[PDB]
C-alpha cells in the first residue's frame with residue numbers, strides 16, 4: 001500500500017537556499033514534520049556537489065525519507081541524483097526521495113521532482129496546504145491543491161515515480 | 170474539488186496502434202500488439218468512453234485526425250483520453266512514415282485553442298519502445314525502454330498496457346486515478362523486473378471515474 | 380561397388396559446404412568479427428575448413444583460461460566425452476513418409492513450394508543467415524532412442540508436439556555444429572524459468588549464476604560454435620569452468636556422484652547449466668529415428684504448420700470448420716482453405732462475426748498485411764464478402780481497396796477492382 | 802585429391818560421366834534415401850556435369 005513512515009528518526013531536509021522569507025517559511029513547516037533541517041546559505045555557481053554526496057555517505061538506514069529543496073535562481077540534477085540511485089546508495093532503498101525545486105529529468109526508482117516556475121506563489125501555497133491538510137491527504141493531493149491555487153491565482157509540474165503512496169503521519 | 174464528470178456522457182477514447190512499419194525507416198515488426206488494443210478498447214469502452222481504434226496511421230494522418238477530433242464538440246462530454254502504441258525511441262512517437270513530435274498533437278487541445286475542452290481532463294497514455302508541453306489539466310504517462318529479452322516464445326502483450334488494463338477494471342471505481350498509476354508502477358517494478366513508467370501530472374483537481 | 384562410398388561421402392561434403400558459405404558470406408557478426416567470406420554462387424571447401432579453424436580457437440580460448448586440471452574431474456571430462464547423445468527436433472509438421480524422415484531447412488523448404496510455418500524471423504536471416512540449417516536439441520542421457528525424451532522444451536519455446544529423436548551416430552551429423560545456447564539469443568535461462576524446477580529448486584544460489592550468463596561476452600553476441608569433433612569436449616570443459624567459478628554443495632554433491640548414474644542425474648545437470656543446440660546442414664534424411672507423441676496437437680498449429688492429415692482428424696463438425704477457416708484467413712494459409720472448401724459447405728451467414736480470440740472483422744482480415752489473395756478471391760466470387768462494405772470497428776470509414784493501396788499490394792488491388800467495384 | 806578424381810569408374814566418357822547414373826549408383830550400392838539423393842544430384846547439375854570441371858570445388 002503506502003510507504004512505511006515510522007522509522008526511529010526522520011531523514012534529512014537539506015534546504016539549499018540561493019541568491020528569503022520562503023526559506024524561513026520552509027524551515028518552520030518542515031520542522032513541524034519532525035525532520036532534520038540543514039539550511040545552507042548562498043553558494044557559488046558550481047556550489048557544493050559534495051554537500052549531498054557526503055549525505056549519501058552516512059547510514060540513512062535509521063532515516064525514513066529524504067528531501068532536498070533546491071531553491072535557486074549551472075549544475076544539473078543528473079550529476080546530483082546519481083548519488084541516490086539506490087545501488088551506490090543502498091541505504092536509501094525503497095524509500096521516498098523528494099526534490100522540491102523552484103527556479104532533463106532522470107527516470108529512477110523512487111523520486112519526485114516538483115519543478116515549478118522561474119515569498120513566491122509556489123512556496124506560500126506549498127507550505128499552507130501542508131500546514132492544513134497533512135493529516136488525511138497523501139503527498140499527491142497536497143501537491144494537487146497547490147497546483148490548483150498557483151494557476152488560478154506558470155504552473156507546477158509534478159513528476160513522480162513512487163511505487164507506493166506517501167503519508168506524513 | 171473534483172472535475173464533476175456528471176455530464177450526459179464521458180468524452181472519447183482514441184487508440185493509435187502502429188505495428189507494421191515502412192521498411193525505409195528500418196523498424197522491427199513489433200508483433201504481439203493487437204491484443205493490447207483489444208484490451209484497451211474493451212477496458213475504456215467499459216466505463217463510458219466511445220473508443221475509436223485506428224491501426225497503422227501515417228506521419229500526417231495522426232496529426233490530421235487529432236485536428237479533427239479537437240474541433241468537433243465536447244460541451245456534453247466529461248473527459249478525453251488518447252492512447253499511443255508505436256515504435257518510438259526518443260520522447261517522440263514514430264509514425265509509419267516519419268517521426269512525429271508529441272508537442273504538435275497537444276497544441277490543438279490547449280484551452281486557448283480548444284475552449285470546448287477547458288477545465289476538463291486530457292489524458293495521454295504513451296507506450297514507446299521528455300519534451301513535455303506544460304498546460305493545466307493535462308496528464309502524460311510514458312512507458313519506454315521495454316526489452317526484458319523474451320526468447321523465441323514471443324511476448325504476448327506488453328507489461329505496461331496489461332498492468333494498466335488489469336488494475337483499472339476493478340480499482341477505477343473507488344480508488345482515484347493517481348492512486349492507480351502508482352500501482353501500475355509497482356506491479357511493473359516488483360513482479361516483472363526480476364524501465365519504469367513516469368507520471369507527469371498537471372491536473373488541478375482529482376479524477377474519479379464514478 | 381565399394382568405390383561408391385567415396386562419391387557418397389564426397390557429395391555429402393559438397394552439399395554441406397553451401398549451407399556454411401551462406402552464413403560466412405552473409406550475416407553481420409562474421410563481417411564485423413573478421414569471420415566473413417566473399418559472396419559467391421558456387422562455394423568450395425574453403426567454407427568447410429573455416430568452421431574447423433573457428434571451432435579450434437573457440438576450444439583453445441576456453442582451454443587456456445583453465446590450468447592443467449586435476450584427477451577429481453577426470454570422472455567428468457572423460458565421462459561426458461565418452462557418452463551417447465541423441466538429438467530431438469520437436470516439430471508439428473508431417474515428417475514420417477511411412478518410414479523415413481525428410482526434415483528440411485528453411486532455405487530449401489522456401490526454395491520451392493513449401494509447407495512452412497517455422498520460427499524464423501527477419502534479422503536471423505540478416506544478422507546470422509543460418510536459415511539453411513536443421514536445428515536440434517541435445518540429450519546427454521545416452522539411453523535408447525525408443526524410451527522417451529525427458530526434456531520437452533528448449534530455452535523457452537515448445538517448438539512442437541512431436542519429438543523426432545535421432546542417434547548422434549548418423550552420417551549426416553558429421554558436418555553440423557554445436558552452440559551452448561541459442562545462436563541468436565545468447566542467454567541461458569536461469570533457475571526461475573528453467574524447466575525441471577524439482578531439480579534446480581532443490582539446489583539454490585547457483586540459479587543466479589546460471590540466470591542469464593551470456594557466452595563470449597566480447598561482442599555480446601559472438602556465440603561460440605564447435606565442430607562435431609569438439610562438441611563433446613566443450614560441453615564438459617565449459618562445465619568445469621562454470622563449476623570452478625561457482626560456490627555450492629551441488630558443486631560436489633551431484634556433479635561428481637552422478638558420474639555413476641549418467642541418466643536423470645546427468646541430463647538435468649547439462650540441460651540446466653547450458654542450453655545445447657545442434658545445426659545439421661540443409662537436409663537430414665534417415666530411416667533410423669523415433670517419433671514420440673509428447674502432447675496432443677491443438678487445432679491452431681495444425682493450421683500454421685500445415686498438416687492436413689492431422690487437421691482432417693481434428694475437425695468433427697462445421698463449428699470447427701469455420702474456426703479452422705478463420706485461422707486460415709489469417710496467416711495466409713492458401714492450402715488449408717482449399718482443403719476445407721472441398722469437405723464442408725459454408726454460407727455467408729457463418730462469417731458474420733469474429734469468433735472469440737479474433738480481433739478483426741471479416742473484411743479487415745481478408746485485406747490485412749500478410750493475408751492471402753487466394754482466399755480473398757474465393758470469398759468475393761462466392762457470395763460471402765461485400766467488396767464495398769466499409770469497416771465499422773477498426774480504422775472505420777475505409778474499404779478493402781484502402782488496405783491494399785496502403786500496404787502496397789498490387790496483386791490484391793487488382794483482385795479487388797476485378798471481383799468487385801471499389 | 803586424385804583418388805576422388807579417379808574413383809568415378811562408372812563414367813564411360815570424360816565430360817559425360819553422370820547423366821543420371823549417379824542417381825543409380827548411390828541408391829544401389831548403399832542405403833541412401835531418395836529424398837536426399839535427388840538434392841545431392843541437384844548440385845553439380847549442368848546437364849552433363851563434367852568431372853574435371855567439378856574438381857575446381859576444392
Ligand SMILES: NC(=O)c1ccc[n+]([C@@H]2O[C@H](COP(=O)([O-])OP(=O)(O)OC[C@H]3O[C@@H](n4cnc5c(N)ncnc54)[C@H](O)[C@@H]3O)[C@@H](O)[C@H]2O)c1
Nearest residue numbers: 468470472481482483485494497498499514515516538656
Ligand atoms: N526445432 C528445434 O528443436 C530447435 C532447436 C533449437 C533451436 N531452435 C531455434 O528456433 C528456431 C526454430 O527453428 P525451427 O526448427 O522451428 O525451423 P525453421 O524456422 O527454420 O522452419 C522449419 C519449419 O519447417 C518444418 N518442416 C521441416 N521439414 C518439413 C517438411 N518436409 N514438410 C513440412 N514442414 C517441414 C519444420 O518442422 C519447421 O517447422 C530456429 O531458427 C532456431 O533458431 C529450434
